Design a binder for this molecule. Sequence first.
Ligand SMILES: NC(=O)c1cccc(N)c1
Ligand SMILES: [Ca+2]
Length: 223
Amino acid sequence: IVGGYTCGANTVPYQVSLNSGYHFCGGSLINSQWVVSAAHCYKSGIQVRLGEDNINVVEGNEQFISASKSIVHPSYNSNTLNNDIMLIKLKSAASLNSRVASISLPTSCASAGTQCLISGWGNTKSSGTSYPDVLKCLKAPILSDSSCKSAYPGQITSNMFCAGYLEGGKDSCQGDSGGPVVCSGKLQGIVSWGSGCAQKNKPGVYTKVCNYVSWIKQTIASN
Ligand SMILES: NC(=O)c1cccc(N)c1
Ligand SMILES: [Ca+2]
């Protein structure tokens, strides 16, 4: 997260870290058994880390649970990142508490201008590299579809939206991928891609979760 702030420990209790020997992506807990992330975060051997604040220090509220299965969206296109969404099932159910909690799925899509909370452990610099140990947060509005498509002509599908600031300076970045965009208490986005981070006229692009609710619910119910 570039241009954000330190969230505070366990203030985003649905945020998870995906770990394969190291943190590599975020995700969101949607029930005690299932996490949503980005398809481009797929790999085998994922351990889901819940209850984290400093990802390099055991602070006492963590749960570390191996994934038993991962399900990439059937229409995911790795060349264009269309349908950049996957589901991860936990080998054992998370123990839900105030610091490990699920986030509700949308009942409809969110409007442009709605303010959202984006979070992650990704890079905090817009040129160069610095990774935080603690979770970072950014408040940012959903941008109009026209401003999104203007910024990325030929690359935005109906399964993507932009959020952030056309002036630059505040954005998600490498290492935030797969993590949440929450608006009005619902998981509306997944950190997906962008041209650099926090650059002018290049807002972050997010997977449009509201298009996938039926797929999520049916997939979970059958797996
Ligand atoms: N360009 C990047 O490193 C990146 C990755 C994920 C999200 C965003 N906004 C940017
Ligand atoms: Ca920790």
